[PDB]
Design a protein around this ligand. Structure first.
Ligand SMILES: Nc1ncnc2c1ncn2[C@@H]1O[C@H](COP(=O)(O)OP(=O)(O)OP(O)(O)=S)[C@@H](O)[C@H]1O
Ligand SMILES: Nc1ncnc2c1ncn2[C@@H]1O[C@H](COP(=O)(O)OP(=O)(O)OP(O)(O)=S)[C@@H](O)[C@H]1O
Ligand SMILES: Nc1ncnc2c1ncn2[C@@H]1O[C@H](COP(=O)(O)OP(=O)(O)OP(O)(O)=S)[C@@H](O)[C@H]1O
Ligand SMILES: [Mg+2]
Ligand SMILES: [Mg+2]
Ligand SMILES: [Mg+2]
Lengths: 438, 425, 494, 118
DNA sequence: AGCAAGCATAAAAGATCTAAACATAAAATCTGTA
DNA sequence: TACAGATTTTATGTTTAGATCTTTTATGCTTGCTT
């Protein structure tokens, strides 16, 4: 029936938040800070007053969500009274941000009604001339994500110029800077600190379980009569959320303890409602929440335990022998020779205590060693996994590491899973369980 | 749903999640979706099957392993997006934007915006999926590129009729866990079991093995007559099962290694088939045991001079034996890295161990052989780009394993084992 | 064509000439009277800046409400006299006036901390000089303002200045040679005095320090009528960059701008609110519009004690003149928010700015959110930091290996398993509350909370491939975390 | 490293193709992918590793694995020639078993020496 | 003669950086000569 | 005599060769000791 399809589509677009801004849902626990975001913007686009605000909060804390909902809300009634320039610290550079600002200014000014032509000096001079100078002024709203990446310790000229525009310009400018650092103020240089208004909004956090319960109720309640199942779906959801013993409340509580983030819960729930074929299956899936358990089990299927549970007999024996030789070593390091010596000692002892376990040779254990290294059960003795920057990665690529020079047999490794962890994971019925206790 | 789920053999949850996330409606599909798993876990296979079952989903397949650094990745994205958009809508008049002009992530954003703003003539919003097969496989990879690719979708226009949805199939979980706070929807691909690997191998290789030319010639050469459709399929399935149950410990749950082993050992297995043993698999296995006893995955170690061989012997003895030569000799500790020494000690040990003529002095030839040995990387130093062999601070070390030096010593009839047997055998 | 090893498809180059000014004329005696030529000293460009003025104007606007606190908020702006800078404005003006009247060259180096009124008083000095010259008391001069932080490249100091004195667009090296010839060689009968303000001179001299030497040296030439007013944050920057000998040769006029005291800052704020403090307004009770002299006749007042405390706090902390104004503006904003919430005015007896508003404005800046942030963290993250603190107590070491935190978390869960909360949370921490999920080495959301703390700036983790040896250390004070996990009852009991 | 090996291989390939044929491309495997469209003729790249012993075997192995990705085009043939100064056992020890199995599909051994056989 | 424990310290491995060598390119400017 | 066409000037980009630095383990020296 098309009614259940419409209901499922509505539920999915409620979870994704792509429903019209006339009916977008704002969680109660974050209905307060939105007002602040609603105030500042409405004091800059309506009252034409400059503002400089920094939103501090963790990843997926509804900074961009609230900042875009407010812009959409102001968009439908004050469309021609402001323009929006969006910058992202990850994909914009110090030189590149000037070009981004110029291009966005020209695009938005043509849209409402060049600056982007020339060298970087000319472009910056023109954007300074335009901004840092019946009828009113168009408000320039900077949505400036990852403000901490453009607040480095070597030079902060973009932030300096933007805050100087906020203070000493006749065109109203509103600058919202989203960041996750709790000490963003100390990142700015003292001139930029003085130019900044010290208006930091710390995004709200979930401090109660009732906050997440109400957020889930808002997410999964269809408030528009579009399907015959809407009333029954609301009844089922309310009766599954009212009782604290239900499976949905249990999973909400577990998310509250472990993750405490609505995006994780909605990621768990989206396939729950997309997988169901008819309304009865959806009701049973929301009453039992079996797919939540399946999703959680799948998410934990490539970590150390999941990878360890997918090893053959030879690979497991080599891993246990390497763990033993790393436990014996004072530095926790080893190599192929020591690990193979311990492995062959273990195999000889097992065969002597006796239908006999085959002892593979060095050429037949090199592949197992490489496979275990690929799964990152072993790493180099002193290895940096991935460099933070592109320049650091380039420098590392240029350098020729001593580890690759030495032969494969003598390369010094170091494990990620210790022998006690192997003892805990490995079942007591294994052949090598007696060999996981050194 | 209007999305059809393909029947993948051992990926039912993964296919269900793919159908749940990847949909033709831009409103109910995530901006970023991640497929995680290791080699041979059937992630590209599952995604290809899913996209083939749904011809109404626009996909732009990309292979970051060919695009070593980030600039080729951005340029290839810019080229392929516009090429695909032109392919789907050849009636839309468009201007060509050179992909080589994309040299920054913002330049990619601007080029994508310029490409998408000329497709506003479409009636309904569409989404094309940029599948990046192996974003973890970039050779020049850092921890900041994925941060750029996550937020790339924010700066592009929200109301455009062409939406870009990224799909990443990464390899390592250590890389994925760096971005665990981004809350990107992820589909995990656990490694297959031995039964799953065996079933995949038979269903993927039995048809090709049963039609192989070698079997075609063997059946007519042995003058055999049987059911072509079924008996040969059973023979190939039994061969694959024998290969799996013989080399699972060596290879693990790795499909590619077992495929290579099957390719290597099928001609030898079929060369042992005859009239009597084809009907009874036990006899055929007993007639070809040597195939399944050794992996055979390998495709006088050096032609060095006697001076070079004795130089290597002296270097190994000097490096792996403590400077206690003064007491008795010259008138395992080999499991660890070789130690360091000086040139004079190496020359003294070389003179001590060199056979008499009455002693061998250090000619030009000895030093030339030593420098050649360093050139062939058999002996190394504490070199760092610039190297000066004549500096007193330069110390030498050995780069041969015990087997190579043992073979060299036995070549010149030298008993290095007797020298090294004092500490341990 | 030739195959290119690499390509530069986005190269953007400006239309700037290369030949300096010294090669434009046949000889020094052939240089005309540059003062009367229509392109050098601003006689050509007058409306170039006005070209972009019309791009940011719109013809639509509703009757916006002007709250009684809106006047106070708008008046306490950086732009918006000169109470305290009267013994220093006087020095700058005296030096510049003496240099201008005698067609001489000089250098004024004014240095101080941010927000203390350097650029403002320099601009006021220049405005007074312009007013004096407009009365023909002193020779006319051209005012050029150069800001070191408003330029992409530090060598754009020349490109600007020459363009501001010749109308030509040259490269930076050609501009430098042109300026050298113009200042050293051109006779004083064919020149106008130039007053250059080198705002944020710190940014100009950071790599090659030649901007400082070039700009200070040009004030030593007899023919040059240049007057350089240098602004920097450090009082001894020329003595370091140039050296003692060069700086002694130049002969600066050095002025230091000390931070404002509480009394001077209070006087600044009072002068900023001279006509608005203790004033009267007509307020439309229906819409909220306030007009300065169903209407209501009200009185706007800002308590003097609020200004006292704001000025004293800002003077004690920083001494900024911007910080006190921003504190007062934020207090006015808080009062306006409360007023609008009480009356529901929205957008489109007497009112006062109380001491509590200024206290809130100060507490917003002073307080730190780390303790509040951890108080509301998830139990897994709090357990992580608790194990980190326990390892710090045991080892007395700032950096703890991640394996130590893992083992300590496991030991903490095992030892006090008789606790009801631990007994009921162990399954959800190790098996995700499911019987089909095997016991996990790392607790649920281990990577999530670890990356949360790393992103928040609470932890610093060294980059290494091995995840069991990476050392995580607190980036905050230990006492903050101690208080944060003392607040929680579960971690306090165990 | 791998990026420079790929860039120097693709630059040589493009230069040789343009010379034999008598716009601009990016120096990566997309050139190998689009060679049939650009020049209209199949591709027969022959790599010659001059001093395999001196070459870092990690980057050589990574480059071989990268070149393996070019096998999905029907218009390309890739041959490799390793100039070895020793026996191939050193290369076997210094290469991953996956690369060894990949090379074992087609390989020929040639004893190139001036003094070989006297 | 022969060697274990404690200490300081020269040193190996590598992060982080600079800069010369190698390379490309648009605007201005020199340079022929019809 | 103005011209196109060759050259220089200014401005970054790509890659290799060489440097200094921190960080951590090897190492000669010293002390105490028995053959
Ligand atoms: N424009 C949007 N409309 C609707 N939902 C959105 C929008 N942007 C983000 N979301 C969703 O909002 C949730 C979290 O909000 P976000 O704004 O993405 O997080 P965040 O505060 O931006 O964290 P950052 O920016 O990475 S530090 C996720 O489920 C997003 O999918
Ligand atoms: N469920 C399956 N059913 C049938 N064949 C499968 C299945 N999963 C994998 N295969 C086959 O096994 C091989 C796996 O190939 P891929 O799916 O490309 O591996 P992968 O997961 O992409 O790993 P990488 O990182 O790409 S090497 C192919 O030859 C597939 O045909
Ligand atoms: N004497 C004063 N009287 C009134 N207002 C003042 C006074 N001094 C500073 N202000 C205000 O505070 C602001 C400080 O600006 P500046 O004078 O440029 O400070 P500053 O010395 O330039 O600090 P920098 O440029 O960051 S080193 C001015 O714009 C005024 O709004
Ligand atoms: Mg964001
Ligand atoms: Mg793949
Ligand atoms: Mg200033």
């Amino acid at each position: 029936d098309p009614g259940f399809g419409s209901l499922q589509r509505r539920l999915l677009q409620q979870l994704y938040g792509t429903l019209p801004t006339d009916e977008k849902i704002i969680f109660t626990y974050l209905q307060d800070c939105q007002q602040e975001i609603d105030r500042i913007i409405k004091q800059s686009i309506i009252q034409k007053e400059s503002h400089s605000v920094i939103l501090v909060g963790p990843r997926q804390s509804y900074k961009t969500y609230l900042l875009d909902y407010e812009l959409s809300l102001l968009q439908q009634s004050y469309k021609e009274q402001f323009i929006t320039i969006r910058l992202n610290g990850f994909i914009h550079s110090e030189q590149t941000a000037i070009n981004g600002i110029a291009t966005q200014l020209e695009q938005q000014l043509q849209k409402i009604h060049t600056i982007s032509s020339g060298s970087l000096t000319e472009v910056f001079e023109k954007i300074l001339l335009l901004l840092d100078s019946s009828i009113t002024k168009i408000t320039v709203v900077f949505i400036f994500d990852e403000i901490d990446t453009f607040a480095g310790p070597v030079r902060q000229t973009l932030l300096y110029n933007l805050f100087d525009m906020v203070e000493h310009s006749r065109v109203p400018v509103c600058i919202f800077g989203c960041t996750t650092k709790l000490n963003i103020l100390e990142y700015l240089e003292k001139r930029v600190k003085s130019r900044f208004s010290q208006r930091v909004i710390y995004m709200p956090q979930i401090q109660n379980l009732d906050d997440m319960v109400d957020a889930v109720r808002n997410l999964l309640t269809v408030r528009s009569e579009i399907s015959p199942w809407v009333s029954q779906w609301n009844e089922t959801l309310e009766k599954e959320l009212s009782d604290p013993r239900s499976n949905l409340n249990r999973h909400i509580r577990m998310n509250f303890e472990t993750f405490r983030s609505l995006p994780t819960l909605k990621n768990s729930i989206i396939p729950l409602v997309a997988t169901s074929k008819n309304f009865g299956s959806l009701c049973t899936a929301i009453k039992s929440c079996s797919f939540l358990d399946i999703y959680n089990k799948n998410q934990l299927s490539n970590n150390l335990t999941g990878r360890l549970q997918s090893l053959s007999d030879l690979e497991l024996a080599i891993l246990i022998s390497a763990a033993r030789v790393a436990l014996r070593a004072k530095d926790g390091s080893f190599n192929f020779n020591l690990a193979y010596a311990e492995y062959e000692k273990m195999i000889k002892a097992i065969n002597s205590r006796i239908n006999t376990i085959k002892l593979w040779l060095k050429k037949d254990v090199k592949n197992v060693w490489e496979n275990l290294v690929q799964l990152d059960f072993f790493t180099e003795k002193s290895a940096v996994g991935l460099r933070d920057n592109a320049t650091a990665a380039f420098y590392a690529s240029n350098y020729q590491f001593q580890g690759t020079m030495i032969p494969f047999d003598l390369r010094s490794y170091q494990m990620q899973i210790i022998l006690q962890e192997l003892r805990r994971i490995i079942p007591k019925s294994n052949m090598y369980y007696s060999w996981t206790q050194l | 749903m209007n999305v059809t789920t393909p029947e993948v053999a051992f990926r039912e949850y993964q296919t269900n999640c793919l159908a749940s996330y990847i949909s033709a409606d831009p409103d109910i599909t995530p901006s970023n979706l991640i497929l995680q798993g290791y080699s041979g876990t059937g992630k590209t296979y599952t995604l290809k099957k899913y996209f083939n079952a749904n011809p109404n989903l626009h996909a732009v397949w990309l292979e970051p392993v060919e695009l070593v650094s980030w600039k080729p990745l951005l340029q290839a994205i810019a080229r392929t997006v516009q090429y695909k958009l032109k392919t789907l809508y050849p009636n839309i008049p468009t201007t060509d934007y050179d992909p080589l002009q994309v040299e920054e992530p913002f330049l990619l954003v601007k080029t994508l915006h310029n490409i998408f703003v000329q497709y506003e003539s479409l009636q309904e919003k569409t989404c094309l999926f940029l599948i990046l097969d192996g974003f973890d496989s970039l050779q020049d990879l850092d921890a900041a590129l994925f941060n750029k690719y996550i937020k790339l979708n924010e700066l592009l226009p929200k109301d455009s009729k062409i939406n870009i949805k990224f799909i990443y199939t990464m390899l390592e979980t250590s890389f994925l866990q760096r971005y665990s706070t981004h809350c990107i929807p992820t589909v995990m691909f656990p490694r297959y079991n031995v039964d799953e690997v065996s079933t995949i191998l038979v269903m993927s290789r039995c048809g090709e093995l049963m039609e192989d030319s070698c079997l075609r010639k063997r059946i007519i050469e042995e003058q055999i007559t049987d059911c072509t459709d079924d008996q040969f399929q059973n023979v190939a399935a039994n061969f694959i099962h024998l290969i799996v149950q013989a080399f699972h410990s060596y290879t693990g749950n790795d499909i590619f290694a077992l495929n290579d082993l099957i390719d290597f050992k099928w001609p030898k297995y079929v060369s042992r088939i005859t009239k009597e043993n084809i009907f009874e698999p036990l006899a055929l296995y007993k007639s070809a045991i040597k195939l399944f006893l050794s992996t055979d995955d390998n495709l006088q170690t050096y032609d060095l001079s006697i001076i070079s061989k004795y130089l290597l012997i002296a270097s190994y003895i000097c490096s792996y034996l403590e400077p206690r030569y003064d007491a008795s000799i010259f008138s395992n500790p080999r499991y660890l890295q070789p130690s360091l020494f000086a040139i004079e000690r190496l020359l003294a040990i070389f003179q001590a161990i060199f056979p008499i003529q009455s002693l061998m002095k250090a000619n030009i030839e000895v030093f030339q052989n030593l420098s050649e040995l360093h050139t062939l990387k058999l002996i190394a130093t504490t070199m760092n780009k610039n190297i000066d062999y004549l500096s007193p601070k330069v110390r030498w070390k050995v780069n041969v394993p015990w087997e190579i030096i043992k073979e060299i010593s036995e070549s010149v009839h030298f008993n290095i084992s007797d020298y090294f047997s004092d500490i341990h055998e | 064509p030739v195959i290119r090893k690499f390509t530069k498809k986005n190269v953007a180059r400006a239309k700037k000439k290369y030949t300096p000014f010294s090669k434009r004329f046949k000889s020094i005696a052939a240089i005309p009277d540059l003062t009367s030529l229509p392109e050098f000293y601003g006689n050509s460009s007058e409306l170039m800046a006005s070209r972009f003025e019309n791009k940011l104007k719109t013809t639509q606007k509703h009757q916006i409400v002007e709250t009684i606190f809106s006047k106070v908020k708008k008046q306490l702006n950086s732009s918006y006299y000169l109470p305290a800078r009267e013994n220093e404005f006087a020095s700058i003006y005296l030096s510049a006036y003496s240099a201008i009247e005698s067609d001489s060259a000089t250098t004024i180096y004014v240095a101080g901390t941010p927000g203390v009124g350097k650029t403002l008083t320099v601009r006021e000095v220049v405005k007074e000089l312009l007013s004096s010259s407009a009365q023909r008391e002193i020779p006319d001069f051209l005012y050029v303002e150069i800001n070191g932080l408003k330029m992409v490249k530090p060598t754009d100091c020349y490109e600007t200045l020459w363009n501001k004195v010749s109308g030509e667009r040259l490269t930076w090296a050609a501009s430098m040679e042109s300026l050298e010839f113009y200042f050293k060689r051109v006779p004083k009968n064919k020149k106008k005095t130039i007053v250059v303000l080198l705002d944020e001179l710190d940014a100009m001299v950071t790599k090659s320090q030649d901007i400082m030497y070039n700009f200070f040296n040009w004030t030593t030439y007899e023919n040059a009528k240049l007057i350089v007013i240098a602004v920097a944050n450090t009082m001894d920057l020329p003595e370091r960059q140039l050296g003692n000998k060069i700086t002694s040769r130049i002969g600066f006029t050095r002025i230091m701008f000390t931070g404002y005291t509480h009394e001077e800052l209070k006087n600044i704020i009072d002068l900023r609110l001279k006509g608005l403090n203790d004033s009267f307004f007509y307020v439309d009770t229906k819409t909220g519009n306030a007009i300065l002299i169903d209407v209501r006749k009200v009185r706007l007042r800002m308590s003097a004690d609020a200004i006292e405390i704001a000025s004293r706090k800002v003077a004690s902390v920083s001494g900024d003149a911007r910080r006190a104004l921003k504190v007062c503006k934020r207090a006015a904003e808080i009062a306006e928010k409360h007023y609008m919430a009480k009356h529901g005015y929205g957008y489109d007896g007497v009112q006062t700015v109380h001491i509590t508003h200024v206290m809130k404005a100060l507490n917003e800046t002073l307080n730190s959110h780390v303790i509040t942030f951890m108080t509301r963290l998830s139990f897994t993250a709090k357990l992580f930091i608790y194990a980190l603190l326990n390892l710090m107590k045991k080892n007395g070491s700032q950096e703890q290996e991640l394996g130590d935190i893992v083992d300590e978390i496991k030991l903490l869960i095992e030892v006090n398993g008789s606790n009801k909360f631990v007994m009921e949370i162990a399954k959800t921490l190790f098996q995700q509350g499911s019987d089909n999920i095997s016991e996990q080495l790392r607790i649920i959301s281990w990577d999530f909370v670890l990356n949360q703390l790393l992103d928040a700036g609470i932890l610093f983790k060294q980059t290494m491939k091995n995840d069991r040896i990476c050392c995580v250390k607190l980036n905050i004070s230990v006492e903050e975390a101690k208080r944060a996990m003392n607040e929680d009852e579960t971690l306090r009991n165990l | 490293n791998v990026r420079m090996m790929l860039r120097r291989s693709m630059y040589k390939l493009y230069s040789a193709a343009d010379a034999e044929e008598h716009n601009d491309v990016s120096y990566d495997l997309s050139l190998v992918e689009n060679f049939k469209r650009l020049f209209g003729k199949d591709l027969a790249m022959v790599f010659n590793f001059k001093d395999v012993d001196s070459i870092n075997f990690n980057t050589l192995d990574n480059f071989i694995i990268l070149l393996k990705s070019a096998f999905k085009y029907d218009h390309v043939k890739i041959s490799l020639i390793f100039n070895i100064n020793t026996n191939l056992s050193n290369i076997e020890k210094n290469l991953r078993q996956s690369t060894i199995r990949l090379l074992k599909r087609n390989y020929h051994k040639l004893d190139v020496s001036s003094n070989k056989g006297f």
